[PDB]
Amino acid sequence: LQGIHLSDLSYKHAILKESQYTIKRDVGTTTAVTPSSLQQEITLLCGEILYAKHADYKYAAEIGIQYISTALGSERVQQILRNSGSEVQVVLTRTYSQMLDIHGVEKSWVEEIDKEARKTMATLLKESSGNIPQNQRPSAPDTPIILLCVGALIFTKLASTIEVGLETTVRRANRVLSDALKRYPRMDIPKIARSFYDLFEQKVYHRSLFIEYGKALGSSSTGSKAESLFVNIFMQAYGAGQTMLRWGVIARSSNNIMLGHVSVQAELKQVTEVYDLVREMGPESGLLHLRQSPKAGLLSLANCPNFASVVLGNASGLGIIGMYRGRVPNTELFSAAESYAKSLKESNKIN
Amino acid sequence: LQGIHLSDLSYKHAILKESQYTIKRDVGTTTAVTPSSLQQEITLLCGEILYAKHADYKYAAEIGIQYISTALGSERVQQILRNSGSEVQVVLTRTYSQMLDIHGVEKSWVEEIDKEARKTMATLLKESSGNIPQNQRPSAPDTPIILLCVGALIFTKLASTIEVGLETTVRRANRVLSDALKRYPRMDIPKIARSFYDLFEQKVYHRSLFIEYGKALGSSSTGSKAESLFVNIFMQAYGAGQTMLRWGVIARSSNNIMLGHVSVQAELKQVTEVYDLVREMGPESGLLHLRQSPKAGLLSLANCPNFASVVLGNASGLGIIGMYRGRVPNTELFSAAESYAKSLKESNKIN
RNA sequence: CCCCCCC
RNA sequence: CCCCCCC
RNA sequence: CCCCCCC
């Protein structure tokens, strides 16, 4: 009975990876970028969104992506979009009287944001004593990263739902971005997060662009505190869409007794197959659900209901499960694992 | 008695694989493709099938395959058809006044579908408040993938019968494609599935084309949620036509006691030969029955009636057998294995 | 189909 | 988010 | 001959 072995998942991944033909999508579409020579101007825009109370926050995400394009460069951004499987033709950004003319972003919107910000600045300078510090002004060099930090907060919740994503973004940005909120008292995290979620859902190649910025930022030798915060949040998104695997390795670390049942031990083989596929893909496996790589779903543990039920029960026992919305297929294993997990958490045993 | 060994199955596969002559079929036949430059138009057609209630859904499968041809490209599609063992001459697609002239698809049909869809859109715009969202319109970019998702649902049931295939397609598409059904309330999954089943049976080289699209989609770096769903369904088709091998590895994982009988232990040698042949073919072994590769049938376990009966009994005991229509040759082994499988399922043993 | 918590 | 002492 | 279930 040693030879009765199939290895289906490795074969599926081998089929998906070994393709001699490249897909082509978004052939007739275009997107906007801004060259690095305009970074000092786009920073202003990315900051002129933050300290004023704007009626429409619709294209804030596009301005954050514009700053990313200034950071990497226009040619590198076109190359990134091309290697992301999307045949989008980059459209460059121009200036006019100065202000920016970003493609697909109406000049009325940019003018409205700039005018609202100028009026707010004049009002806060006229009434107050005219002692605006260097960090409270729109031309601060970390304002684009503060906007991209809200974007990165909503990036970590792209596997989740829209409403859960917005609530988590607001809750976490009131604390993660407390200093920016103090510097810019009137920044509407809900609307900016909504804009970023809309951008990430509509233009999926910008997820790849956004990921490339994270790499280009994490590999840098120096950075401000805003960029370090952005990288911290960006890395919090790494295992997005695959929390079941993380809870499985947690259960294995917990030495759950219900892991030794007959059905769990029956499915452990294909479970180890899923983990081997994770290792096979390597570093980019974590970014599969963030990118909406169609290859995602090879890492699903839905084909092991007893293992999934035991792991969710262990998570519920440790209190980790929180408000996870997954299904528990086998309730008896879930409850038994929960009981053991509570017993282990409550008990204090030292070796 | 160590040398009394034959290895017939390896020899049969060696004969089949090591052929110096290539077959030629469909020599005088032609098929239609659409170049990528028309993708933005074909998308419309692939979506103009979905939100209107059409009398004839006869060539919907050809429109899905046309979108696949736009995605891969005309030259790559001709090459795919050539390497699939079929000498079909590709015929390109043209436009006229705009609409498409697909070869083998009557222009009356295309005009009828377009006119029905335009009339339905006008009716739903005139009566309603004229607030059609961006996902409910025919020009949505995931509509071709929604049609190909119905096609992929009927693709997983190509080893099954036509009626079972259509019933499963409707049942699964009311749930898998619930969001598309909400977006397009009036999409007739039965008729579209019938069209796709007819296409897959008549033109078998389009199975190879359809498989190539799955690879070109699974290997992509990014994709929409529709394409991820399509790849999920496409991978659900992987072991099609070979569920007996999957249930055999399930039985081995279950540690069924009836595996140790004399006749089961007698046939385990050639059973392991079948599994070794699976490993020998490698990743493409799963796609043999989907492709109707004549080499399929080397993976049949019909020459091991006692092993097949024990495995089917184990499956019936675990409740996995469902409504499987295979034959049980040896009823005593089937019943004994079923009894042990029920006993193991009912019993909760933890190591 | 998949995903779904907290940081 | 992270960091946080003494030398 | 083979295939045949569910997701």
Residue numbers in the entry:
A (entry chain A), B (entry chain A): 3 to 99, 112 to 365
Publication excerpt:
Upon recombinant expression, N is known to take up host RNA and self-assemble into oligomers. Template-free 2D-classification of particles revealed that the sample contains primarily rings with 10 protomers. We obtained a 3.1 Å resolution map of 10-mer rings of N-RNA, a significant improvement from the previously reported crystallographic 10-mer at 4.2 Å33. We observed that the overall map quality was slightly better in the CTD region of N than in the NTD region, hinting at a degree of conformational heterogeneity in the NTD. we also determined a map of the 11-mer ring at 3.3 Å resolution. A structural alignment of the refined N protomer models solved by cryo-EM and crystallography shows that these are highly similar (r.m.s.d. of 0.5 Å). The 11-mer of N-RNA possesses a diameter of ~188 Å, slightly larger than the 10-mer at ~180 Å. The ring expansion by one protomer is accompanied by a slightly increased angle between neighboring N copies in the 11-mer: 73.6° in the 11-mer vs 72.0° in the 10-mer, in respect to the center of the rings. Thresholding of the map at a low level indicates the presence of additional N protomers, however, this density was too diffuse to fit more copies of N, presumably due to heterogeneity of the sample or conformational heterogeneity. It is notable that in this arrangement the RNA strand is obscured by N protomers belonging to the next turn of the assembly, suggesting that a conformational change is necessary for the genome to become accessible to L/P. Taking together our cryo-EM reconstructions, we observe that the lateral interaction of RNA-bound N protomers can support a range of geometries, demonstrating the plasticity of N-RNA and supporting the notion of a highly flexible HMPV nucleocapsid.
